[PDB]
């Protein structure tokens, strides 16, 4: 520790006698890494959803994450370093977030009658990001790693392989409605928080905001699901014992 | 002795807006036998006479000056220059006690306000005759009903606490000997679910994290190690 | 202008300002308490040796009572105390110490069995019986003749100021610590109440109200030598003078301890020779049975300390870069009888003296102690600016006289408290004031000025070397021993800086949380106080009790059975006004004679005084024929007053 | 919600007027919870340190959890159950003792400050207990999940291949430190905070409990790194391209 | 005997008995201002119309 971090904590101002900005540099970042992540989560629907166009199509894409267009026909330990990445922004904002949780018996029994009394819509869908937030606390840690250990089982065949013959899907289900409740939500409540939609009628701007969220979630919540379905069945339709699908290699590997 | 020692002290004033916190180097040649109630004192007479502190006894035993000595609670009148190895002290008021200037804080009317929250007093029902005679009790039990009536509320316990420093209605170490040197003193009619109304709750002795800051810093050398785990023992059984 | 009042203020939150403060919150009346710094804080908190009460517990309190500690208490008073007071007393301690166990405090009690004493000698196996076990024990003190000093280990003062102070946060007492009283409020010689200033905030506030009752402790201070706290400068008995309406008595009585660890000056219990330990000299032998032949330890302070400079002066001091002294070898004392019930007065000497007490003798050396002297009052506790009370080693109740007796102390404390406390319930209960916003603001908006000039003051004296000279002055020449030419160059510099005093001046200008300013407005009235004591004592030609005059070595009876009444009825005099007031021989339970001890026949006799005794004998032996009991005879010989709750008979073991 | 979920709220007292007896049963399971896994965590550093004993030695075991003697030569699907089980009294700590967490920008700095300050040994462990307790948010979850979903994998070849094959190692090396720091503390926090050996000197009792917590867990950090480097040799002499490690069955599978 | 002192003691905290411990308070005069509600819901806040000043 420094001088003015005892300074700061016996008096509880900057030695320069002010208020530390930290706190806000602080609730910066929580809405911060959280928009991060909150994007990133849409984007990866979609370079996901692709395997709903034929085993080629989506095989593709995953290789160009391994930007096979400059180093061979592919490169899986940049995929690692994407994961390896979007795994520490998802790390800071759990860190960050869940300093805004609620924690020992008062604080919760209190907010929880609340919510059941009130029945206020909005108080009612933080809740959702509180639970939903801590849920992924140990699912998404699971998938993450793997996308950073493995990245070579990436593929329209060895990526169904994992589905069902080490089991992912009892998680991938759960984990599929976390993710985008969490994430819809925290996005809505992102844009209400620092308003920078409000305008001339911010009272009209929080109604489409309102409603808006929810098709854009609903239909990430269908085709996020068929996009689900798609690598189940290519899973079960995968009996050959002489064959290696985790790794079912085509050139610079699969 | 007659070696250079280098003084660091904290100050602030909080009620003057031009005060920033920040420190303080004086330079004393030691003495043999020098407390820091001297030094702190020559210091007051001689260099600086703004400086703010408070001692009374001077022995040891009335649990005024209680303050950060090289970042450890302990009491000033009874800590040597001797013991401080290169010769550098660094003074701090005590940690989570309202401050009123630079090294003097209000250990008082926490304390006149901790002893009302947990009740520290005799609760008997009747009073007894002071005419007639007295309550004979086992001589070896008033001796451990001493033993704990000897905390001198210092705020050591209180200044080294973790927990009390984040979370601040802890009732801490200190409340929680005093809660039990009722409990086993005879005169006094209290149960154990009459204990657990003020102290059964996550700001009683359920916040305590057993740090075992306490216990290691108690100037007076009392059982808090267990004694708080005692009382833990009951009130997580009652009801 | 800021304004609060209550029923009752209480300025001393010690221990017996405190008990008072219960026995007028306990009925109705609204009370606050003023006080330096928190209660529990305070200087009864160390408390070593004990509290004395006729109680008669123990194998030896046994067959103790009223009488015998009557006595014990008188004729260690040297006859220079008032015979009814000590009497309502001694009828009060034992019921008193009773209230104090029921309340919590832990008293060390008595065990079935044979126990391992040590007396003067040495061991002698004691065996209490079994119909004594649980009950409050005892120890052996100074200069009794019967174990009735009762203890908690030897930190009996803290078991007691806590288990009181508890007892007003129960009540609803009002504590406000961090608060001063710099002044007191009277009208037409009435007291309405006081002038505080917030040590924090710093400014000042009236604080009015029917009854007001000061408890400021001794002024051991005003010595550079004391075992008094630092907070024990004697503000409060310097703003009773101030009035120049009310006066202090004995101021020049001051009670000098023998082994105060050197030089610190931190006590070292008598609980030491009460427990068997003993006196080593220089050449380490024991000058005890030596100089005094019934034991120089046991033997009352004025005693037991005078030939600890003899042996001194005689060049016999083996000092060091500080100054000579002697040593307490309680080594022989077992390391049980010395681990505990001597437990502080063994880590005192780890942590400040570096060296073992189960092993060594210390380097102690007689300093001041206690402040028999202090506000002058009646028998009921009020003083001559009717309403304003007092009680505590404070002030001048006077059941003391010129030499109080180890153990008294804090049992006068508590006592007073619980008498005085009636006398000020029924006072503010009763009494009616006219409170003036005339006479409120005078004083106010006259403290806020006197402030201010000290603020604005050029002047250029170091109040640090003013108050540290003064201390000085003292312990110089109004030490154990004193002497005609040395109670004069001292009397003139005490005046010379009590002028000075007046030109001083302060670096920091806050008006507020100011340590510096402090010392400002409180060392001139120290010097004030100063001045009542060695200018008390200069007039005073005569040896009685702790008042050794090398020059009039003998106990005047004929001329000197008064009490040294100071005043100051003026603001500008530099001097008080010393009157005397006398004391009646046909008023006494016991006539003027040897104390049992201290040296022999050295007391130019009295005529009354014999006649009184020979009347005494007279009606003694008579109400014996007649098959009267002590309490009979004792209301022949002379009779005291006490309030209605505390008037019963003290109940004790086998009757 | 119930009318005296209300009432406690409203008021802060139970209908029948006394403070929720909720914080003492909270106050138990935290520590309930904590102490089991404490010792299963020692349980596992031995039924799974047996691979420093032949494949065989080892082999055998992982037989055994599955109840061979009683369904037929193997059963995969019961320590899917344990490990379902112990995945839930995971979780259920963490829930329960992350309210002992610092939570705002304050109660952190404040509380770090102290920590250097004082340099007190005790209160400088906790530290470690609430960071390790963070970290195994992440990190203990994948291999939970795992011993849940491919039970079979389990092995003296197979685990060794998951060790390096699938990357675990770079995981099972961080992770051994903390499941081994959170667990050797906090039973001894755990003994003095309840204190059953306390005695008649629990100053000397506290004494031997804090140096016993060491040569225990000096033994279990040693122990614990032999039988790493056991699955990780193990690991890297396996290159034929002609097997299935993962699946490397002998009977009942392997 | 619950009692408490003030310079100026102000029964009512509308908008009149405030006003006038401002000209009080402003000037050393330690006041109090007693009121049977919060002062800002006494019965003045429900004013209409408006205030008429000759402007
Ligand atoms: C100093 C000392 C005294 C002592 C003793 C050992 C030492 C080192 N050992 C004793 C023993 O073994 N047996 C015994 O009987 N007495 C012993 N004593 C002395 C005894 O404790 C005292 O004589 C007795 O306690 C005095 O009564 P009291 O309790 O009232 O007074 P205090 O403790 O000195 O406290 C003074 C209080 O008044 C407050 N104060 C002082 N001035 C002011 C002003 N101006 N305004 C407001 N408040 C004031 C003090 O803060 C304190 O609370
Ligand atoms: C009722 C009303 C009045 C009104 C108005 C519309 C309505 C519905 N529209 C007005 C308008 O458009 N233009 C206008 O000029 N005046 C209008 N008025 C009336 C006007 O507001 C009042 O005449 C004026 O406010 C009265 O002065 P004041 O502000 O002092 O008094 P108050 O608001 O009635 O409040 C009384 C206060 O005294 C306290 N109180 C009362 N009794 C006690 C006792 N016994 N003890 C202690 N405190 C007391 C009340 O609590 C309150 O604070
Ligand atoms: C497992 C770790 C996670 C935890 C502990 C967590 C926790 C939280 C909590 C409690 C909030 C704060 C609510 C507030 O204070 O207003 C929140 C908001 C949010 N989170 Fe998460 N979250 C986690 C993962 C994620 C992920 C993976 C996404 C990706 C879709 C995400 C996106 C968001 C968004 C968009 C916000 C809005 C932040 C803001 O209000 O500024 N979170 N999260
Ligand atoms: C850089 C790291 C990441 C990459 C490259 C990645 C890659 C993938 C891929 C290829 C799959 C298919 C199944 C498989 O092969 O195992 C998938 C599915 C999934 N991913 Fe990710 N992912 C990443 C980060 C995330 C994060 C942080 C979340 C949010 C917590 C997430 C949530 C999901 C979920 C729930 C599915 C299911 C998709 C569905 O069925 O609709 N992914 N991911
Ligand atoms: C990843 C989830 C975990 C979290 C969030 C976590 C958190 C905590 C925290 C902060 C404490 C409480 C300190 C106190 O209040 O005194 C603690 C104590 C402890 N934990 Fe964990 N822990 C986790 C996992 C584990 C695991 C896997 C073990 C197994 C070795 C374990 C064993 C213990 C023990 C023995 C205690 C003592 C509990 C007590 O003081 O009553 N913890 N943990
Ligand atoms: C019922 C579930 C569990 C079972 C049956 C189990 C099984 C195993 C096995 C067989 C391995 C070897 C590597 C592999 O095959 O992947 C292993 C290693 C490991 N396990 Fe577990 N485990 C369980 C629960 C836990 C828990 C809850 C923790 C603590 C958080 C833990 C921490 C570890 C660590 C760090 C290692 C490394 C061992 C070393 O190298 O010393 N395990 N576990
Ligand atoms: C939304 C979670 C927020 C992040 C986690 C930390 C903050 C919230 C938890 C801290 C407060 C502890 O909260 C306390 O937990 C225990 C779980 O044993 C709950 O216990 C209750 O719910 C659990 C779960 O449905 C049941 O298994 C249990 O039988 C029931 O009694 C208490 O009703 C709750 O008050
Ligand atoms: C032990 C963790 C306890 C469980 C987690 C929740 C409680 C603790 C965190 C809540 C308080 C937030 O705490 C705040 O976090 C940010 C991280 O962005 C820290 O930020 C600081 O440390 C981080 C991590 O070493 C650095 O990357 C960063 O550059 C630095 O400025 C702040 O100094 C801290 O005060
Ligand atoms: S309990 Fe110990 S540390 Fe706490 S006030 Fe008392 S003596 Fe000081
Ligand atoms: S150190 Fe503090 S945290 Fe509890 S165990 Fe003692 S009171
Ligand atoms: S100064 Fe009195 S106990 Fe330290
Ligand atoms: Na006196």
């Given at each position: 520790m420094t001088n003015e971090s005892i300074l700061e904590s016996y008096s509880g101002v900057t030695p320069e006698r002010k208020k530390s900005r930290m706190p806000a540099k602080l609730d910066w970042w929580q809405s911060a890494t959280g928009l991060f992540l909150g994007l990133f989560m849409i984007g990866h629907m979609f370079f996901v959803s692709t395997i709903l166009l034929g085993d080629n199509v989506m095989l593709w894409v995953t290789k160009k994450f391994q930007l096979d267009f400059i180093f061979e026909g592919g490169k899986p330990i940049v995929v690692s370093f994407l994961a390896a990445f979007v795994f520490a922004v998802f790390i800071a904002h759990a860190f960050l977030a869940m300093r805004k949780f609620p924690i020992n018996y008062r604080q919760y029994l209190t907010f929880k009658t609340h919510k059941d009394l009130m029945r206020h819509g909005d108080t009612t869908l933080w809740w959702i990001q509180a639970m939903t937030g801590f849920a992924m606390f140990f699912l998404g840690s699971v998938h993450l790693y793997i996308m950073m250990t493995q990245p070579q089982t990436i593929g329209p065949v060895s990526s169904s392989f994992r589905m069902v013959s080490e089991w992912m899907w009892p998680l991938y289900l759960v984990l599929l409605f976390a993710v985008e409740l969490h994430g819809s939500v925290g996005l809505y409540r992102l844009a209400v928080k620092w308003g920078w939609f409000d305008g001339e009628t911010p009272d009209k701007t929080r109604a489409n905001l309102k409603k808006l969220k929810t098709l854009m979630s609903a239909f990430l919540i269908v085709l996020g699901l068929l996009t689900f379905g798609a690598y189940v069945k290519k899973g079960l339709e995968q009996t050959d014992p002489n064959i290696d699908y985790k790794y079912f290699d085509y050139k610079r590997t699969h | 002795m007659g070696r250079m020692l280098t003084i660091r002290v904290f100050k602030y004033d909080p009620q003057s807006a031009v005060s920033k916190p920040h420190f303080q180097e004086y330079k004393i040649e030691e003495a043999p036998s020098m407390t820091i109630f001297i030094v702190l004192n020559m210091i007051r007479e001689?260099?600086?006479?703004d400086l703010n502190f408070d001692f009374v006894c001077?022995?040891?035993?009335?649990?005024?000056?209680g303050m950060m000595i090289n970042g450890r609670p302990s009491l000033a009148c009874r800590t040597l220059t001797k013991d401080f190895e290169d010769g550098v002290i660094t003074l701090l008021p005590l940690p989570a006690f309202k401050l009123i200037k630079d090294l003097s804080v209000d250990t008082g009317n926490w304390f006149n306000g901790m002893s009302q929250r947990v009740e520290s007093w005799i609760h008997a029902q009747k009073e007894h005759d002071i005419s007639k005679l007295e309550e004979r009790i086992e001589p070896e039990v008033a001796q451990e009903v001493f033993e704990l009536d000897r905390c001198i509320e210092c705020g050591c316990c209180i200044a080294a606490c973790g927990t009390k420093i984040m979370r601040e209605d802890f009732v801490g170490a200190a409340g929680l000997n005093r809660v039990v040197r009722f409990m086993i003193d005879p005169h006094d009619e209290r149960t154990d679910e009459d204990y657990y109304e003020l102290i059964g709750d996550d700001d009683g002795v359920f916040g305590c994290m057993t740090l075992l800051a306490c216990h290691d810093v108690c100037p007076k050398n009392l059982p808090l190690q267990s004694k708080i785990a005692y009382l833990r023992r009951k009130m997580v059984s009652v009801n | 202008m800021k304004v609060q009042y209550c029923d009752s203020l209480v300025i001393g939150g010690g221990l017996a300002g405190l008990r008072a403060a219960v026995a007028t919150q306990q009925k109705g009346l609204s009370t606050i308490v003023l006080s330096?710094?928190?209660?529990?804080?305070?200087?009864?908190?160390?408390?070593?040796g004990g509290m004395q009460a006729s109680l008669g517990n123990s194998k030896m309190s046994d067959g103790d009572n009223e009488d015998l500690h009557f006595m014990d208490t008188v004729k260690g008073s040297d006859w220079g105390c008032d015979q009814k007071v000590a009497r309502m007393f001694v009828n009060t301690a034992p019921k008193a110490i009773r209230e104090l166990a029921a309340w919590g405090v832990p008293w060390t009690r008595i065990h079935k069995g044979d126990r391992m004493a040590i007396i003067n000698a040495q061991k002698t196996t004691i065996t209490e019986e079994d119909f004594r076990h649980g009950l409050i024990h005892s120890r052996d003190f100074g200069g009794?003749?019967?174990?009735?000093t009762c203890y908690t280990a030897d930190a009996t003062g803290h078991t007691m100021l806590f288990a009181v102070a508890n007892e007003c946060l129960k009540l609803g007492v009002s504590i406000q610590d961090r608060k001063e009283a710099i002044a007191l409020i009277h009208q037409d010689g009435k007291c309405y109440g006081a002038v505080v200033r917030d040590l924090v905030t710093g400014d000042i506030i009236a604080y009015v109200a029917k009854g007001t009752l000061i408890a400021t402790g001794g002024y051991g201070r005003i010595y550079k030598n004391t075992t008094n706290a630092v907070v024990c400068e004697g503000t409060g008995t310097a703003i009773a003078l101030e009035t120049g309406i009310a006066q202090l008595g004995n101021m020049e009585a001051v009670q000098f301890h023998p082994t105060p660890l050197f030089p610190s000056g931190i006590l070292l219990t008598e609980g030491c020779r009460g427990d068997g330990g003993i006196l080593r000299d220089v050449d380490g032998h024991r000058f005890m049975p030596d100089y005094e032949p019934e034991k120089k330890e046991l033997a009352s302070r004025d005693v037991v300390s005078r030939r600890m400079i003899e042996h001194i002066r005689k060049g016999k001091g083996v000092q060091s870069p500080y100054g000579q002294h002697l040593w307490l070898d309680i080594s022989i004392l077992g390391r049980k009888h010395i681990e505990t019930n001597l437990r502080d007065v063994q880590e005192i000497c780890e942590y400040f003296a570096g060296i073992d007490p189960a092993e060594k003798w210390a380097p102690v050396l007689p300093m001041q102690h206690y402040s028999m002297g202090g506000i002058r009052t009646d028998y009921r506790g009020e003083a001559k600016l009717k309403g304003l009370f007092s009680a505590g080693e404070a002030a001048c109740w006077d059941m003391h006289g010129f030499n109080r007796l180890g153990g008294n102390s804090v049992s006068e404390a508590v006592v007073a408290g619980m008498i005085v406390g009636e006398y000020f319930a029924e006072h503010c209960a009763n009494t009616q004031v006219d409170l003036e916003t005339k006479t409120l603001e005078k004083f106010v908006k006259g403290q806020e000025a006197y402030m201010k000039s000290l603020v604005e003051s050029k002047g250029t004296e170091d109040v640090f070397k003013i108050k540290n000279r003064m201390k000085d002055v003292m312990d110089d020449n109004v030490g154990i021993f004193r002497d005609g030419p040395h109670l004069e160059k001292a009397v003139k510099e005490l005046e010379e800086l009590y002028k000075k005093s007046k030109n001083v001046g302060i670096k920091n200008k806050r008006l507020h949380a100011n340590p510096e300013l402090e010392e400002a407005y409180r060392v001139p009235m120290m010097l004030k106080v100063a001045l009542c004591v060695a200018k008390g004592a200069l007039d005073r030609t005569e040896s009685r009790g702790a008042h050794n005059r090398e020059d009039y070595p003998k106990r005047d009876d004929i001329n000197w059975l008064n009490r040294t009444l100071a005043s100051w009825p003026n603001p500008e005099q530099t001097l008080p006004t010393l009157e005397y007031e006398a004391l009646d021989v046909n008023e006494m339970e016991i006539a003027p004679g040897?104390?049992?001890?201290?040296?022999?026949?050295?007391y130019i006799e009295n005529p009354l005084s014999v006649k009184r005794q020979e009347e005494i004998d007279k009606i003694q032996s008579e109400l014996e024929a007649a098959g009267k009991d002590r309490h009979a005879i004792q209301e022949a010989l002379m009779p005291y007053e006490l309030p209605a709750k505390y008037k019963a008979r003290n109940e004790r073991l086998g009757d």
């Open positions: - | 001689t260099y600086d006479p001077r022995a040891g035993i009335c649990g005024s000056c | 330096l710094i928190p209660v529990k804080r305070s200087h009864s908190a160390a408390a070593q009794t003749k019967k174990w009735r040897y104390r049992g001890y201290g040296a022999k026949g050295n």
